[PDB]
From a paper:
The protease-sensitive VP4 proteins protrude from the outer capsid shell, forming sixty spikes that are responsible for host receptor interactions. Each VP4 protein is cleaved by trypsin into two domains, VP5* and VP8*, corresponding to the stalk and the distal head of the spike protein, respectively. The distal VP8* head interacts with RV host glycan receptors for viral attachment, while the VP5* stalk assists in viral penetration into host cells. The RV VP8* domain adopts a classical galectin-like fold with the central structure being an anti-parallel β-sandwich formed by a five-stranded β-sheet and a six-stranded β-sheet.
The crystal structures of P (strain BM11596) and P (strain BM11596) in complex with LNFP I were solved. The VP8* of P BM11596 strain adopted a classical galectin-like fold as similar to other known VP8* structures, with two twisted antiparallel β-sheets consisting of strands A, L, C, D, G, H and M, B, I, J, K, respectively.
Author numbering:
A (entry chain B): 1 to 159
B (entry chain A): 2 to 159
The structure:
Amino acid sequence: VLDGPYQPTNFKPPNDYWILLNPTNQQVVLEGTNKTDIWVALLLVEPNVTNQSRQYTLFGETKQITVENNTNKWKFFEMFRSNVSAEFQHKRTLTSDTKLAGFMKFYNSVWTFHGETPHATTDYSSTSNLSEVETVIHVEFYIIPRSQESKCSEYINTG
Amino acid sequence: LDGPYQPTNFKPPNDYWILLNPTNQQVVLEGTNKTDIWVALLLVEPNVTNQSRQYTLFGETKQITVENNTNKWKFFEMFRSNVSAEFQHKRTLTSDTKLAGFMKFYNSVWTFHGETPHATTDYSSTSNLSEVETVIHVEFYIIPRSQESKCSEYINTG
């Protein structure tokens, strides 16, 4: 059984747990940083979006970020930087008909799901300061132990 | 299979896949119509830790952050729609086959993305498809769109 739902909050997720993210229509889904070498934001882009510059507030900064979604699925744009002064790069995309995404702190790395349902897979970004990574979660969420990653992947891919 | 052709600069014909077969070229393809579409495919080898690399795209020197945690090759699809804009990392093809594609079709530029063997096609829109030309830095083949199923097979299984 999933642990949740939890309402949107700002907290320090424990190690070895998946945060399963369940947006409705929030532009910004998750902001995670340790304020030293990790800044990850997941943005949500609805279906049938023409290439356009959209405005997002990320870690209090006003950013204009080019997005497109030619599909009838939802896209999570994973935006990353490793330096406080840098611009965000569009690192990964999750293309989803479940509208579920993932975040986990494990093994000196921050993990997300990417690719296109139902073949979304995990990948990571490296950090020397995992313990200080804190998340503003803008959405309803659940917590799943890493031991149950297979169910977390089933949910992300099939709902 | 029509090829292999050598690296060249030319205007690909509408409704044909260019099937790109790098060895170790870091810039695989540069395509533009010099008005509303610039695409560059960059090749990032297996097991590259997060770093800044230098690429010359359309005569401009760029510093682009890249990373590849996997045992697959990654093609980073860099894109802009305006000559003054920086490139954005728009898509990635994560490949065991070291094959990528490009096609001018239906007022769009088409490429493959995702992870083999489930890579699929998506497009970027242009209002001037006919003027899109490509510098191709790799050996390549030419497959009609009528045989796109074979082109997807090659992308996904080699």
